[PDB]
Amino acid sequence: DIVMTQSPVSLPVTPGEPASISCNSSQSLLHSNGYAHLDWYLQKPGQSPKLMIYLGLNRAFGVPDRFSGSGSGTDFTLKISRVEAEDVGVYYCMQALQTPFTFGPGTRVDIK
Amino acid sequence: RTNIPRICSKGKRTVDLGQCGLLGTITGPPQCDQFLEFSADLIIERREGSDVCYPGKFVNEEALRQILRESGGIDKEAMGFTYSGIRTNGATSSCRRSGSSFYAEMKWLLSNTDNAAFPQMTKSYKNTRKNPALIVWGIHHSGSTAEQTKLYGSGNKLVTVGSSNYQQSFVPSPRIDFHWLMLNPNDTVTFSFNGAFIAPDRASFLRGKSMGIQSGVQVDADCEGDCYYSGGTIISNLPFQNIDSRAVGKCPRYVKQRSLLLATGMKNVPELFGAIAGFIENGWEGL
Amino acid sequence: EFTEVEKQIGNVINWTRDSITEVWSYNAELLVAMENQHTIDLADSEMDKLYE
Amino acid sequence: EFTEVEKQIGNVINWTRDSITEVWSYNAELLVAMENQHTIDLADSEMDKLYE
Amino acid sequence: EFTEVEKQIGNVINWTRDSITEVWSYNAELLVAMENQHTIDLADSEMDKLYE
Amino acid sequence: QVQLQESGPGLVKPSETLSLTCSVSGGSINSYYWTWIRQPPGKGLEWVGYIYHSGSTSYNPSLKSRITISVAPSKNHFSLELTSMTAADTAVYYCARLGGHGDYGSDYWGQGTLVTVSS
Ligand SMILES: *[C@@H]1O[C@H](CO)[C@@H](O)[C@H](O)[C@H]1NC(C)=O
Ligand SMILES: *[C@@H]1O[C@H](CO)[C@@H](O)[C@H](O)[C@H]1NC(C)=O
Ligand SMILES: *[C@@H]1O[C@H](CO)[C@@H](O)[C@H](O)[C@H]1NC(C)=O
């Protein structure tokens, strides 16, 4: 079992800020090549999460350029260079290196 | 010296590829649509058989043919790739099943619209089963730089494939070069690309043991045969032959002499110990 | 037989196959001679054995 | 044995080694049969020499 | 001989030629020894034939 | 695109076997891993186990010997079957294939069905 932790728990945002969410790991999440096996999920309230950042630093389709993941080894951090009203929601980081698969506690990103 | 000029090989699963090439059963041209998941103990090739419909060539094609000949047929398993942000419906006028199409087993990747972009997409596959895989991909060497920019956006293109043992990189030089790979079980291939890439869709898995020939005659189902050469079937219990030295299977070995006669009979004296053709004058006919 | 292998390795394969053909042809000729001589001598020995 | 050689030259090496194995196995079988026959004939010849 | 070939195919060619050299040397030894036996046997057989 | 959609009961008695379904559209189950993401109300996402198209599965160690994920003989249908349903196990069950087993920049989720354990 691989446990997930991240900081902070709730980071409030004003519309228009440089913001940073960091997710840590208890074991180095590097596969045989294949970059670093951690992905970023973003859940709207009362919907399903959709992929924002895959393999730590690559942007998925449909993701605006404001989102930019980064990190290596066991320190992974998501950066947002411009916050609008549609970024409100719980943030989940998932490791996909070895079974079993766990999520983070969740980053409840509120406003103000 | 007498050979049956027909491939009579009953008791064995036999497929006749015809217009289909031996390397084509993985790639999937329009001429190999019924041999995509073939299973046989005798894979016959032909002179007119072409491996590809689009103009191009393989890499280590003789090694891949020697792998496929004893493969016993190939079992296709879908690798599960689906692509978002790029077009996977590329076609050409060279390969035509009903209209302009491409290979059934692999998918040509393009951009959304012409000259727009190409995202850096990286994919992976893990061998769940215990047989070694037969992963093959392709690199599209375009005719012109303008056509390359139209198909895959502006900029240089870099395609690399990595695994536990295989590790290489390819750059197109402005027509399709297919590169295969032997993938051990519990190993993850990595298809990192940002441009021209004939992306795979299904993985070939080897079925067992067989033997392949290269002939030019028809197929029959009457003999119990073991070895077949390029112009028919050679069956005998004799140890030596004179027909062809390139025969494959279990057959007499090739020698240059055309008639080596073993004296099954004894010494003839018609009308070393010194009895026959010795104090005995002549042989007898009434016995 | 249809497409051509690389010329150097193809010439190596033809040289090896021609040498193996020479070895098997010599072995077949010597073998055929050996049991032809042995069959003739065995028939002569059986004839002399029944005579004695 | 540990790190695999290129597939074409490996197939050439295995085909050459298999042909050499066939040649040596046939030569060994013919050798054993020939000298067993010669030893039996030598024993018979020595018995005939003593008898005569 | 003047210009060295690629090393892997050079070792393959040398190994193949050194195996065929051993095969031909062993075959020559058997051929020569067998007929030095057979010439003596034939001469002794002819003398025994004249004797009887 | 491979679109997914799940369905099932919403009123389930305690200590009764749960059974869902998730019918795909746009493709078929002939490749890749199929994941059965759990979400209790107000809590984080919990992975309970993926299933391959061949039949091999890797269940959650915390919920071992309670969930029997199986794929139907039809190749466009795979389902969850949970035994001994608990009132603390009330969650919002999801259905997805996740882009970490393979194709990295592509995933497709379901809609989210509601199950409730009450008498
Ligand atoms: C090898 O010999 C065959 C004839 O047996 C010939 O057709 C072929 O061209 C030769 N290979 C090369 C590379 O010359
Ligand atoms: C050659 O034969 C050996 C067994 O003697 C086998 O392990 C090896 O894989 C063969 N080489 C190739 C290239 O298949
Ligand atoms: C092959 O053997 C010869 C001697 O007969 C030697 O001169 C030559 O260097 C050898 N080739 C290689 C590649 O070592």
Automatic annotation (TrEMBL), chain B:
In natural infection, inactive HA is matured into HA1 and HA2 outside the cell by one or more trypsin-like, arginine-specific endoprotease secreted by the bronchial epithelial cells. One identified protease that may be involved in this process is secreted in lungs by club cells. Its main location: host cell. GO terms for molecular function: host cell surface receptor binding. Keywords: Clathrin- and caveolin-independent endocytosis of virus by host, Clathrin-mediated endocytosis of virus by host, Disulfide bond, Fusion of virus membrane with host endosomal membrane, Fusion of virus membrane with host membrane, Glycoprotein, Hemagglutinin, Host cell membrane, Host membrane, Host-virus interaction, Lipoprotein, Membrane, Palmitate, Signal, Transmembrane, Transmembrane helix, Viral attachment to host cell, Viral envelope protein, Viral penetration into host cytoplasm, Virion, Virus endocytosis by host, Virus entry into host cell. Glycans are attached at residue 186. The keyword Transport does not apply. GO terms for biological process: clathrin-dependent endocytosis of virus by host cell; fusion of virus membrane with host endosome membrane; fusion of virus membrane with host plasma membrane; viral budding from plasma membrane; virion attachment to host cell. Binds to sialic acid-containing receptors on the cell surface, bringing about the attachment of the virus particle to the cell. This attachment induces virion internalization of about two third of the virus particles through clathrin-dependent endocytosis and about one third through a clathrin- and caveolin-independent pathway. Plays a major role in the determination of host range restriction and virulence. Class I viral fusion protein. Belongs to the influenza viruses hemagglutinin family. This is Hemagglutinin. It comes from Influenza A virus.
